[PDB]
């Protein structure tokens, strides 16, 4: 047990831990971050994303 | 935020002083959240007692830990308090307050006086 | 393992008033947990102070604290009449809590 008091210096104080694994693969991502669509367009020089 | 304390005002020499202690505004069931009993006798400072948290985990005060057992009922919202072999100086104010660890006790109730005799 | 405190304090209203509370063991730790209570008499303890200088909700700006080593104050700034009331000082220790003997305000005038 660790038995965690409150008198405790920093260091003897519990910590919350969440790890966070990311995959950056080469399969259809499922997990994307708050971006909007635009349209798609073709046959034109463009900065795709 | 409130707390409510009822029970015998006036207990015999080696009897038991049984307390209840009725709350509402919050649980009692979540994390960090517990209740205690602290005690005032006449001309004297605060008497930690007892206290009881969430997971039903039961501390005593050193002192009294031979003496003293609490329990809880929380589909009533109810904390009880019992001390043993009660003494005629144990003549006290008895008070019922939540328990907060940045913060030992707040929402303090009135208190029920107590006296052995 | 005893809380210290200075029996009384006095002052006139609208000067500055200092109530004193000191550690007598180690078993308090990093000590960084102390409340102060405000207690009139017929009326159940209210919490001025907590984790040492913080305030709860209800209560007035006049009202302050901090820690030096293993002691701690409290700061009752523009004292008002209606100040006179038992003060006390709670922290923890290794096994328990602890409350302070009780420091008994008196105004003067």
């Known amino acids: 047990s660790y038995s965690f008091r409150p008198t405790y210096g920093v260091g003897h104080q519990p910590y919350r831990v969440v790890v966070l694994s990311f995959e950056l693969l080469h399969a259809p991502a499922t997990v994307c971050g708050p971006k909007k669509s635009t349209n798609l367009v073709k046959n034109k020089c463009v900065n795709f994303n | 935020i409130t707390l409510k304390e009822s029970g015998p005002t006036l207990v015999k020499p080696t009897q038991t002083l049984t307390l209840t202690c009725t709350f509402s505004?919050?649980?009692?069931?979540?994390?960090?959240?517990?209740v205690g009993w602290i005690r005032q006798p006449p001309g004297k400072a605060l008497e930690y007692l007892a206290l009881?948290?969430?997971?039903?985990?039961?501390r005593y005060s050193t002192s009294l830990k031979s003496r003293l057992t609490i329990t809880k009922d929380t589909s009533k919202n109810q904390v009880v308090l019992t001390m043993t072999n009660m003494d005629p100086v144990d003549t006290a104010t008895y008070y019922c307050?939540?328990?907060?660890?940045?913060?030992?006790?707040?929402?303090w109730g009135q208190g029920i006086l107590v006296t052995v005799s | 393992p005893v809380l210290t405190q200075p029996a009384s304090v006095s002052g006139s209203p609208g000067q500055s008033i200092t109530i004193s509370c000191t550690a007598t063991?180690?078993?308090?730790?990093?000590?960084?947990?102390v409340s102060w209570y405000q207690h009139h008499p017929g009326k159940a303890p209210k919490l001025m102070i907590y984790?040492?200088?913080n305030r709860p909700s209800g209560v007035s700006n006049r009202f302050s604290g901090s820690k030096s080593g293993n002691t701690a104050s409290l700061t009752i700034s523009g004292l008002q009449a209606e100040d006179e009331a038992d003060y006390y000082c709670?922290?923890?220790?290794?096994?328990?809590?602890?409350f302070g003997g009780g420091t008994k305000l008196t105004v003067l005038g």
């Open positions: 307050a939540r328990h907060t660890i940045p913060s030992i006790f707040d929402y």
């Open positions: 505004g919050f649980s009692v069931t979540t994390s960090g959240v517990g």
């Open positions: 009881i948290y969430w997971d039903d985990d039961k």
């Open positions: 063991s180690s078993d308090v730790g990093n000590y960084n947990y």
């Open positions: 984790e040492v200088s």
């Open positions: 709670s922290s923890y220790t290794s096994s328990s809590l602890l």
